[PDB]
């Protein structure tokens, strides 16, 4: 005649969850204001540091909450931040789960998701990337898989972009790169190209793409080809030349050398 | 292939448990609270989660609320109140013959539906004729229609039983004389009715003596023995001082006899 029964309401969760963000849809109950630019997006602390540990630092009082507790967003890639339906997107997700990931934003997604250390959304975008995987945005998506550490995703694009090298170098996209990777590249030995002749045309592209800001990591850029494998025709001819080169003492002094080994390995 | 696709939809199939489950780890920290109930003892909670959990919060939009005193003085046991409080967190609650009550009144105040109707399926597992009065009392206290049906079916097929016990001398006017307008209830003879009614109102003379002459009013007088009636009904103190229940006997006892030629 003695008994206790366990009750367990098995969609009690879900809803309870859901019912806490069409609370924040309203702003009811809503204690904390994530400011980007600017647009201000509503929410519940509870739930925000539940979702992730991004957010319990805030209790101590580490974040620039106005009275009424609005806490401000580090600028981020882009100027004008993520897109609004974006931003809404990632904060839905962490009180409910659920998140709709396209083309379109998953760059976006992307950032949001490391910025806010959500590891299950971070990998999601990582395999979503994976699947559209393609020698048309290789480029820009091995520069992503760096940028937020995807290892999986950086070393199948990275495989694409060597087998392609030659490829991706007549495409614009390539030219937009960052110094340090267009330095991690010309440091690949697997790179897949007919001659180090090309590598030569390519740094002068992409310092080229924008004189001002560049021309001051080609000697680290050109330091980096190996003369010793270009034809001597094109060294004295093309190279020696052009006037990154010649300006240069440590270039030209470089192009010599190499010049005098290719004499010296005559035999 | 994939070469096509625009989106895709991604859903972490535990994230709300864990989620709902957190916010209970905080709770109990009294981290990020924002309300406090009281009845005494006082419990922190959030605000967003009593809403979603109950419309009975919604109408509140750090400050305490004070609970309006329940049945018992001393207010509902705290580890109950935590429990049913976990439980809007969580959706999980562990029920005994021992908290059961107190559950279903929490429940009943916060309109925890499921968690009442819970509460009635366990009861009515529990339904015996040593709790049946208890029970059937709060099926009726907090409308619990299928359980008050269930008991009061079991009250009635052992009436004669019942009135022996002590329990049943403690329900309120209403019930008894609802059980007196039964004509289902199953007795031996009209004449205990009689003396259930007297028992009942000699328990607390004070409160009582005023609805004897309404509840005298339910007895079918004319189904009692001639002897009983002048012997032991109309000597009654309650019946003598009333000249509406004197009446009574007298027109029965009239009746016994125009009854009687054939
Ligand atoms: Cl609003
Ligand atoms: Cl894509
Ligand atoms: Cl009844």
Redesign the interface.
Same mark, same amino acid.
């Given at each position: 005649?003695? #008994?206790?029964?366990? *009750? #367990? &309401? $098995? $969609?009690? &969760? $879900?809803?309870?969850?859901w %019912?806490?963000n069409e609370?924040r849809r309203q702003g009811? *109950?809503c204690?904390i204001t994530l400011c980007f630019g600017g647009r201000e997006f509503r929410a519940? %602390?509870?739930?925000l540091?539940?979702?992730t540990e991004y957010f319990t630092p805030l209790?101590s009082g580490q974040f620039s909450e106005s009275r009424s507790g609005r806490v401000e967003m580090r600028k981020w890639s882009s100027e004008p931040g993520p897109e609004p339906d974006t931003v809404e997107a990632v904060i839905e997700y962490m009180? @409910? +789960? %659920?998140? %709709?990931? $396209? @083309? +379109?934003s998953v760059h976006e997604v992307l950032e949001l998701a490391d910025r806010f250390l959500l590891i299950?959304?971070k990998e *999601?975008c990582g395999e *979503?990337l994976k =699947? =559209?995987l393609?020698l048309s945005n290789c480029v820009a998506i091995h520069s992503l898989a760096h940028m937020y550490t995807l290892s999986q995703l950086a070393l199948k694009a990275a495989d694409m972009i060597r087998r392609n090298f030659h490829k991706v170098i007549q495409d614009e996209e390539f030219y937009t790169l960052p110094f340090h990777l267009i330095r991690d590249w010309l440091s690949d030995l697997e790179i897949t190209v007919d001659s180090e002749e090309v590598l030569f045309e390519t740094v002068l592209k992409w310092v080229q793409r924008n004189a001002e800001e560049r021309e001051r990591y080609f000697e680290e850029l050109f330091k980096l080809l190996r003369l010793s494998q270009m034809k001597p025709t094109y060294l004295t001819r093309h190279v020696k030349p052009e006037r990154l080169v010649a300006n240069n003492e440590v270039c030209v002094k470089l192009v010599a050398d190499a010049v005098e080994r290719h004499a010296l390995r005559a035999e």
């Open positions: 005649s003695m #008994e206790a029964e366990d *009750f #367990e &309401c $098995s $969609s009690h &969760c $879900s809803e309870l969850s %019912r806490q609370q009811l *109950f204690d519940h %602390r509870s739930v540091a539940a979702a209790l009180y @409910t +789960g %659920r998140i %709709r990931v $396209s @083309t +379109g299950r959304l *999601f *979503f =699947k =559209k393609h």
